[PDB]
Each structure stands twice: as C-alpha cells, then as structure tokens.
C-alpha cells in the first residue's frame, strides 16, 4: 500500500518505548 506505513507515528511510538524503558531501568538503580 503506497500510503505511509505510519511514519511520523512509529517515530513517536519508538521514542515513547525508549524513554519508558530508560525510566524503568533507571528506577531499579535508585530502588
């Protein structure tokens, strides 16, 4: 399908995934 596979949306989702994983990982160090 020539219409965008989601681009400009998968970037937001990927950034959200990265930041939430970083937050979860950095939580364990302090706790």
């Amino acid at each position: 399908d020539p219409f965008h596979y989601d681009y400009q949306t998968l970037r937001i989702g990927g950034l959200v995934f990265a930041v939430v994983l970083f937050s979860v990982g950095i939580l364990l160090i302090l706790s």
Binding site: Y5, D6, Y7, L10, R11, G13, G14, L15, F17, A18, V19, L21, F22, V24, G25, I26, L28, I29
Partner: protein, 989 residues
C-alpha cells in the same frame, strides 16, 4: 647495572682513614682542600632520575596497543574520501566523518587506557626529608654550621641528639649517645656507639653511623668516609630508581590477547582484501571493504571495558581503605603465587608491649585484647597487684599530659622502649599510672646502666599510715635471683628451694625460647628497726642492702603479632599461597614470631631444631628432613643464584632474617625467577627497592614511612592484613569476572565480520554497515560489559588453586572457541535472518539476493528489477538497505540480551545462581533504550544512516536468541553433571 656490595672500610683504624683522605683528625679540614675535593667528588645531593617523560608516555600509549589498526583504518577512510573527490560525483561526507570519528575513538582509547598505565613512581623526592640542610662540622678546629649540600668527604662532623647525620661517617670518639637506625635494619631499637670494631660486618659494626640517621640520645663526632652517590642508601636509591618495574600479570595477559586478536584481524583483512582485488573490485570498493573488515573484527570498545572494570574494583575495595595507586595492581594481588612479608609493622604493632608473665610458679599470658578475653589472669590476687606496683614504680618514663583522648595502647610516651612497654601494661591493667606515682613519693634512686644491669628506687607505702620504705628493683632475671632470698606467693612469703630454683630456671628458659628479653623484679620492705624514717639516703655511698632480697616475678615484653594477622595468614596459606618472611632482625625473634603468627606450622621444625632434639650435630642430619628453614644473612653472601633457587624449591616455609635491603631484592628476584608472582609487604625505607621489584607492592599506611607508601602499588590505610586476604580473594573474583566480560564483548565480533564475508563471497547487498559497527561496539557492548564486573562469582572460590601464570591465560584457544565458534555464529545467523526477513518483506525474495550486489550498489542503474517484478531506483533501494542495517543492529541487541544472560556465570545456571545483580538488569534495559532511541530519532537518518523499522521486525531475533540461551544452559548442565570431561576441556573458557 647491579650494585650489591655496600663495602665500607670499617676495619681500618682512625689514623689510616684520616691519612688516606689526608684529613686532620683533630683539626678537620681546610676550606681550600674542601673546595678542591668538592670539585672532584661532587655535591652531596643524590642524583635524581634524569629521564622524566612528561607527555611522551601518552603518545607512546596511543601509538601502541590495539590501535595501529585504528589509525590504518582512519588513514584508509581519508584515502577513500580523497579518491571519491577526484573520480566520483560531488563528494560525500559519509567517509570524512567516519575517519574523524575513528580518530576520535583512537584518541579516547589512548587517553582512557592512560589512566591505568600511570607509573606513579616519585621515590626521588622522599629522601630530601632526611639529611637536613644544616650540619655542625669541625673545620680548622672551629665548630661551624654548614649546608649539607656542599659538605665533603674527610671532615670532622659532630653528631648531637635528634640531628640526622649528613653522610656515612666512622665515629672517631663516641660521647654516650644512642642511635636507632630504623633505615636499613628496620627497627626502633637503639644501638650503642663506640670506635671499637665490634663486628667484622660493616652493617653490624658499632664504629659507623649510617646515612640518614640520628644518634638519638647524646652527641658524637666522626669523620665522613663516603658521601653522595657512593653512599649505601644512595646506592639503594639508585638501585630502586634504575630497577623500574615488571609488567603486571594483567598487563602481560592483555598484551598477549591484543597481539592474538590483532594478528587474526590483520590476517583475515589482508586475505579478504587480496580476495576482493582478485575478484576485480575498484580501489574505492577495496578500501571501503578493508575499512569495514578492520572496524568490525577489531573490538575498539574493549580496552575501555577492562579499564572501567579495574576502576570499579578500586572503588569497591577503597571502601575498605585500600588506596590503589596503580590500577593494574588490583589484579596482581589475585595471583600472588608467593607473598613476601616484613617483620616490624606489617605483622606487629612496631612497639614493644608485655606479652607474658610468671608468678606463683605459674605462667600467665598477657592479653592483647582490651577486655582480657579468655580469663587471661587474676586481678584480685595480692601477688599480682604487688607485681603491678613493682612494674609501675620502676619506670623512668612519663605519659604526655592531656592525651587521655586516645586509647592507652596508642599514646606516645617519651623514654626507653622497655619501660614504656611496662608502664603501658600497668596503665592498661590497673589504671592511671600518674596518680599511682603521685601516691608513692620517690626519695632515693639508683641509675640504670649496662655496667649495673639493675635499677632500684625507694618509695613509700600506698596507705598513708606506717609508710615503710619499699626498695623496688628491676634487672636481669639471673642477677635478681642471685640477690634473692625469699619468694612472694599470694601475699605470703616462702623461702627458696633447690626445686623452686630449678623451676624458675625452667620457666626462664621457656620464656627465652620465645625470643624475648626477660626481666626480673624485686622489692624489699626495709625494717624500721634498722632503717627508720629518719634515715639518710645517698646515691654514690651505699647505705641500703644488696643481698638477701626477695624475688617477686618475671616479665616478658616481646613486640606482639597483630590482632588479625594469624587467621589471615592461615587463610592465605589455605588458598595455596606460600608465605615467605624476610627481615633484617635477629633470627631468634624472627623464628619466634614466625611460630606465633603461623608462618611455620605446629609440628614442623627447622634443621637446628631436629639437631638439638636428637643431640646430633647439624652436619650429620639431612636438611631434607626439615621442611621449614630459617637462615641468617651472613651465609646468604656466600650463596649464588642456584643455591637460593634450591632453598626456595626444597624448603616449604622459610623465614629469612638479618638481611640487607639489597639481599631482600636478591631474595625477591630469586622467588620471582621460579615463575611465581611475588608480593612483598613492608613499611620501612629498607625494602623500597624490593617493593618496586615485586609484581605488586603493599605498604602500611599509618605505620609506614612516606618513601615506602609512595613506592608501593597499593597502600593499606587501615593497616590490616585481613584487608590483604580480602584483596587476594577479590582479585581472584575480578580475574574470573574479566574472563567473562572479555568473552561477552568478543562474541559480538562474529555477527559483524560474517556480513562482510557474505557480501564478498555471495554477492548480496551489504547486510551490516560501517557506522553501525561503531554504534554496536560503543553503544551495546559498553554498559552490559561493565555491568558484568559487579556480579560475584560461584561459591567455589573457597577451594580454588592459585592461577597458573603460564597455562591459564586471560584469553585462550578454548575461549575463542566459545565466542567465535558457537555463540558468535548464532548472533550472525539471527542477524542474517532479520536481513532476509525484511529484504523479503519489500519485494526481494531470499532466493534472488545472490548475484544482485553488482547492480545493487551501481549508481547509474535506476530500474533494478526485484523478485516480484517491480523496479527500484538507486536511493529508493538504498533506503531499504539502510532500514535493513537498522534491523541488523536491533537484532544484534536482541540476541545480546540472551548473550549476556548466558555469559553471566561459567558453571552455575541462571536458575541456580540467580539474577541478583541489580546493575545487569539496568544494563539490559539500557541496551533496548539506546537501540530504540537511536533507530527512531527524527533528523538522524540523514547523518547516522539509521531509519525507522516496523514493530513486527523487532521480533525477528526472538526465535534465535531463545536458541542460544537453551544451548548454553544445556552445555552448562552437561558441564555440571560430567566434571573433568571433554566438554569441560574444550568449552570451559
């Protein structure tokens, strides 16, 4: 050069030495003669090391190691950019930026490995503290203050109390001063001075005062015999400076590992470069392929992992106050095939205290523990309190006022060491000695001297009423026994018996067998019928009684072994680490402390002990019978290298005593020549050269001088030996952990080489790019690799043999098999699976990718037919290739999850040892975070060549990362169930 003579003209009398330098014994020397002899022999300032590399160390470090290849790759990137700017279209920055970042990588690696290879050796500036600037000399019959820099050889130098001597001199006239060397011999015990040549050895002769020492009590004059570099301790300084250091075991292992990996990398690179040239690639293609191979096979982000592992080791062990100077030393203490030890300071408290006593025909052990653990002795017995009175009264030392804020065992007191020990024991036992001395006023006393060997003092009674005059007496046991007539037991007074005297002699011999200078006490209450209160008291004229006294008790005051040294030494020996004791003290005390501490085990005896037990001369008994041997330093001068090696090989627990510092260096070199890794511990200036020669040098913090502590690889600030046993256990731990981290990092090399191998051997589009190789190496092999350094190893460390320094290398042929053979292949297989999945999800069937690379990377063609029938232009398919690069990187991270999970432990499974490491989970989460961030950040594809990928493609590596986990668990299960098998031999890295 080797300098181990230290010869001095001690035997020659004063006139010969005065004439040989043509120097007046009574008029000193003239100014003109001093000038013309200074113009020959030079100034007294010992020569500092001339070579002072300022920044050439950093340049040499960046030029060497595992880099040359990185510089070659950077040069090739610059060459490729130059080629692309003269033949191709408008120049692209994708190669110049790669070269710049590669140069940045090599610079950061060089400046980061510089942190560990920092030779912190500044022993030159530790000797200016001695030899004070001003010295009192006798020139032209006149006393003169003169600078210590221009004092020459052959001039009268006076020596007062507390003034360190300016040069090695033979005393011409000794005026009652006592000197304590504490430099070459290494003890606080003072020594007498006399022009007579008492001993043939210049070290033990009493007519010389050694350099950088002060005759503590009194004043004496002499003639300088040598100064400057021709000085015994100047010779020691030069030997220490020119000795340099030996490569640490971690340095040797890292050098070998880098050599092996660089050799493999260059071999494979040149092989496939000539293969590509044969295949018919253009120069740009060949150079870019070579750059890819070089940057992929070489693990650039690896020498930055071991450094941080060692830094984390230092941080962890610094919480126990082990100030690590050389970063590599933390590893060396693990190996320590043998450990050399010192007598004073390291194993003792450096000061003498009471250890044993005898009364009521009974031996009582003075307790080093402050609470008197184990009911050491009674405290309510009248005989004991009387003995405490006697020991307290006879002291001629006084505690410093207002120093009650420190425990009594750590308070400095001015006076003799023996009386200091006695008064410290009395203070610890009874209480405030000052109030005690105030209660009993002194009215008459007799000085203590060698010609007397006894001292006496007349005091009153504790109760104010009936102040009977008590004459207290302290001396050698034999003299007091001879002067004695009755014995005091439990307050009552009995008379001497032949059996009682025999028992006293037996006890005295038993105490003397402990290498201690036993003292005997006495006290007589003068009758008031003959010696009333109004009795005249004198010193030179005798008016007291000398015989018909009454013995009260013996007293032992050996310097005690440390509180935590015996158990720690036992633990070190139980870990397979042989312990050798070296010192410059007397052999009897050395053997006594060796037996007490635990260096020589119970039931093992030396050759002389067997000879004495069997009443047979030492010649007729074979030395092979005795495993433990103790030797003097006088026969070591007549010992060659072969003799020392034989002594080390045969005898199992040795103790060396009365050894000069150069002899200590000879001993440590002989110990190291047997293939061992020697670790010497000490605190004095004498063992400063030896501390440099040993692979790791340990110096005591509080009890050690500045020279010893700044010449050591590690300083024990807490000054505890349990610290060093914890250190060796932790060194074993960090070695076993490094052997896992290195294996982890190396496994990622195969999935970065194999894509190039298929790109050159199968003609398929490039699966893995070049910049993404940097991304993988420095982004996904850094945080987990460092986090691996935190987990504690298996519980087998209690029953582990010392590391063999020539068979158990850091990286061996059995670890390359685990990384490059099995674990690495699954990584590349998963990467290729993701490659083929996403190339097959866009139109390129996996069965057609062969033979398409020639037209895939061609710039001109813009109608490349895929498998489904459609066609692509250049950038339109280059976008797909870049997306596939991102997929390869993501799949690498996904499979590195399981790689970390399975490389966590060598034997114990994850289900058994458990994921108790709080930092490994954070590292695993960080692998995902950076991978997602770096593959999805907008505005990055134009620079880092990183395109977004669909969520489903995140799952491509799941059914292969699962396989490697199961495979490693199965091999670990086989390992556990079948010890010593073929699997253990060929797969246990």
């Amino acid at each position: 050069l080797k300098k181990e003579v230290a010869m001095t003209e001690h035997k020659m009398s004063v006139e010969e030495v005065c004439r040989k330098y043509n120097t007046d014994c009574v008029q000193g020397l003239t100014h003109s003669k001093a000038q013309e002899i200074l113009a020959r022999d030079g100034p007294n300032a010992l020569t500092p090391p001339p070579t002072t590399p300022e920044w050439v160390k950093f340049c040499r470090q960046l030029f060497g190691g595992f880099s040359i290849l990185l510089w070659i790759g950077a040069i090739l990137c610059f060459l490729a950019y130059g080629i692309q700017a003269g033949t191709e279209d408008d120049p692209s920055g994708d190669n110049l930026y790669l070269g710049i970042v590669l140069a940045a990588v090599v610079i950061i690696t060089g400046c980061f490995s510089y942190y560990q290879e920092a030779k912190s050796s500044k022993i030159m500036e530790s000797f200016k503290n001695m030899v004070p600037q001003q010295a009192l000399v006798i020139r032209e019959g006149e006393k003169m203050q003169v600078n210590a820099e221009e004092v020459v050889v052959g001039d009268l130098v006076e020596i007062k109390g507390g003034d360190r001597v300016p040069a090695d001199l033979r005393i011409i006239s000794a005026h009652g001063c006592k000197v304590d060397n504490s430099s070459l011999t290494g003890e606080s015990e003072p020594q007498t001075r006399s022009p007579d040549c008492t001993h043939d050895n210049p070290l033990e002769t009493r007519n010389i005062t050694f350099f950088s020492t002060n005759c503590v009590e009194g004043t004496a004059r002499g003639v300088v015999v040598a100064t400057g570099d021709r000085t015994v301790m100047g010779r020691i300084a030069t030997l220490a400076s020119g000795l340099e250091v030996g490569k640490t075991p971690i340095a040797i292992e890292i050098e070998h590992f880098i050599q092996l990996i660089t050799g493999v990398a260059v071999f494979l690179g040149v092989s496939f470069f000539i293969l590509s040239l044969i295949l018919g690639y253009t120069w740009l293609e060949a150079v870019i392929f070579l750059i890819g191979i070089i940057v992929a096979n070489v693990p650039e982000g690896l020498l930055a992992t071991v450094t941080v592992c060692l830094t984390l080791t230092a941080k962890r062990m610094a919480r126990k106050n082990c100030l690590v100077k050389n970063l590599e030393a933390v590893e060396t203490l693990g190996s320590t095939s043998t450990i050399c030890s010192d007598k004073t300071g390291t194993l003792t408290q450096n000061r003498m205290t009471v250890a044993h006593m005898w009364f009521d025909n009974q031996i009582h052990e003075a307790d080093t523990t402050e609470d008197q653990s184990g009911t050491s002795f009674d405290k309510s017995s009248h005989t004991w309190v009387a003995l405490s009175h006697i020991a307290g009264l006879c002291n001629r030392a006084v505690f410093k006022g207002g120093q009650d804020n420190i425990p009594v065992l750590k308070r400095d007191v001015a006076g003799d060491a023996s009386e200091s020990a006695l008064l410290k024991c009395i203070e610890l036992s009874s209480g405030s000695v000052k109030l005690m001395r105030e209660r009993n006023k002194k009215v008459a006393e007799i000085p203590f001297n060698s010609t007397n060997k006894y001292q006496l003092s007349i005091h009153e009674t504790e109760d104010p009423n009936d102040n009977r005059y008590l004459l207290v007496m302290k001396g050698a046991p034999e003299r007091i026994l001879d002067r004695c007539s009755t014995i005091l037991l439990q307050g009552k007074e009995q008379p001497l018996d032949e059996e009682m005297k025999e028992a006293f002699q037996n006890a005295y011999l038993e105490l003397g067998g402990l290498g201690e200078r036993v003292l005997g006490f006495c006290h007589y209450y003068l009758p008031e019928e003959q010696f009333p209160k109004g009795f005249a008291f004198d010193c030179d004229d005798v008016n007291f009684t000398t015989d018909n006294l009454c013995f009260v008790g013996l007293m032992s005051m050996i310097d005690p072994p440390r509180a935590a040294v015996p158990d720690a030494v036992g633990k070190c020996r139980s870990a397979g680490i042989k312990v050798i004791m070296v010192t410059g003290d007397h052999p009897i005390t050395a053997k006594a402390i060796a037996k007490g501490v635990g260096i020589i085990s119970e039931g093992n005896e030396t050759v002389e002990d067997i000879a004495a037990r069997l009443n047979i001369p030492v010649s007729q008994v074979n030395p092979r019978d005795a495993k433990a041997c103790v030797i003097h330093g006088t026969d070591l001068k007549d010992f060659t290298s072969e003799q020392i090696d034989e002594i080390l090989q045969n005898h199992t627990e040795i103790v060396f005593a009365r050894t000069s510092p150069q002899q200590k260096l000879i001993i440590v070199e002989g110990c190291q020549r047997q293939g061992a890794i020697v670790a010497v511990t000490g605190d004095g200036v004498n063992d400063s050269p030896a501390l440099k020669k040993a692979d790791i040098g340990v110096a005591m913090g509080i009890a050690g001088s500045d020279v010893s502590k700044q010449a050591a690889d590690m300083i024990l600030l807490d000054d505890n030996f349990a610290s060093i046993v914890t250190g060796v256990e932790e060194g074993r731990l960090i070695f076993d952990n490094l052997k896992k981290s290195i294996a982890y990092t190396l496994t990622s090399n195969i999935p970065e080489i194999t894509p190039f191998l298929l790109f050159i051997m199968a003609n398929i589009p490039l699966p893995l790019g070049t910049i993404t190789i940097l991304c993988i190496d420095l982004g996904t092999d850094m945080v987990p690799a460092i986090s691996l350094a935190y987990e504690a190893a298996e519980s087998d460390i209690m029953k582990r043999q010392p590391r063999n320094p020539r068979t158990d290398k850091l990286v061996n042929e059995r670890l390359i098999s685990m990384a490059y053979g099995q674990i690495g292949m699954i990584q590349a297989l998963g990467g290729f699976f993701s490659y083929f999945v996403i190339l097959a999800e866009n139109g390129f069937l996996p069965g057609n990718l062969v033979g398409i690379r020639l037209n895939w990377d061609d710039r001109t063609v813009n109608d490349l037919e895929d498998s489904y029938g459609q066609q692509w232009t250049y950038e339109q398919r280059k976008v797909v290739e870049f997306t596939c690069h991102t997929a390869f990187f993501v799949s690498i991270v996904v499979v590195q999850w399981a790689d970390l999970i399975i490389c966590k432990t060598r034997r114990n499974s994850v289900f058994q040892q458990g994921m108790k490491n709080k930092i490994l989970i954070f590292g695993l989460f960080e692998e995902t975070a950076l991978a997602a961030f770096l593959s999805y950040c907008p505005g990055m594809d134009v620079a880092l060549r990183m395109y977004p990928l669909k969520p489903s493609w995140w799952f491509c590596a799941f059914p292969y990362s699962f396989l490697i986990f199961v495979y490693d668990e199965i091999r670990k299960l086989i390992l556990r169930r079948n010890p010593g098998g073929w699997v253990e031999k060929e797969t246990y890295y």
